[PDB]
Amino acid sequence: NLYDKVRMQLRDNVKELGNGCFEFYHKCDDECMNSVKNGTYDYPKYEEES
Amino acid sequence: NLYDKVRMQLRDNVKELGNGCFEFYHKCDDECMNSVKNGTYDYPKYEEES
Numbered sequence: 001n002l003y004d005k006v007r008m009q010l011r012d013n014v015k016e017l018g019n020g021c022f023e024f025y026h027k028c029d030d031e032c033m034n035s036v037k038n039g040t041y042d043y044p045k046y047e048e049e050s
Numbered sequence: 051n052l053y054d055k056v057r058m059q060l061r062d063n064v065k066e067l068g069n070g071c072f073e074f075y076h077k078c079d080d081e082c083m084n085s086v087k088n089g090t091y092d093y094p095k096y097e098e099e100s
């Protein structure tokens with residue numbers, strides 16, 4: 001449930017590695033990680049691969 | 051189970067908003083919505099973002 005709670009919060013700004021981890025497509029510093037662990041996250045334009 | 055039944059039926063012609071809702075990438079009128087609620091849906095070329 002944490003895995004999906006987090007996947008839904010993170011949407012497409014991350015990729016699943018298939019081993020229980022999410023890799024970010026943007027620099028995610030302590031302040032970001034602190035946001036991911038609770039009810040918030042918003043990083044709208046970090047696609048490079050698109 | 052409805053969330054996934056619907057996600058599988060809708061595939062990539064929709065996006066998950068992460069709050070229990072699916073946003074369509076195409077105009078989806080009453081006739082479409084009536085199809086989504088039961089065993090049918092087929093909208094092959096509505097990507098704009100691709």
Ligand SMILES: *[C@@H]1O[C@H](CO)[C@@H](O)[C@H](O)[C@H]1NC(C)=O
Binds near residue numbers: 034038
């Ligand atoms: C969520 O984490 C951020 C970052 O540390 C913090 O500012 C915010 O107050 C926290 N929200 C709750 C409800 O704890």
Ligand SMILES: *[C@@H]1O[C@H](CO)[C@@H](O)[C@H](O)[C@H]1NC(C)=O
Binds near residue numbers: 081084085088089090
């Ligand atoms: C599914 O919904 C469509 C649209 O209203 C309808 O035409 C079709 O007969 C319905 N199928 C079933 C099995 O109810």
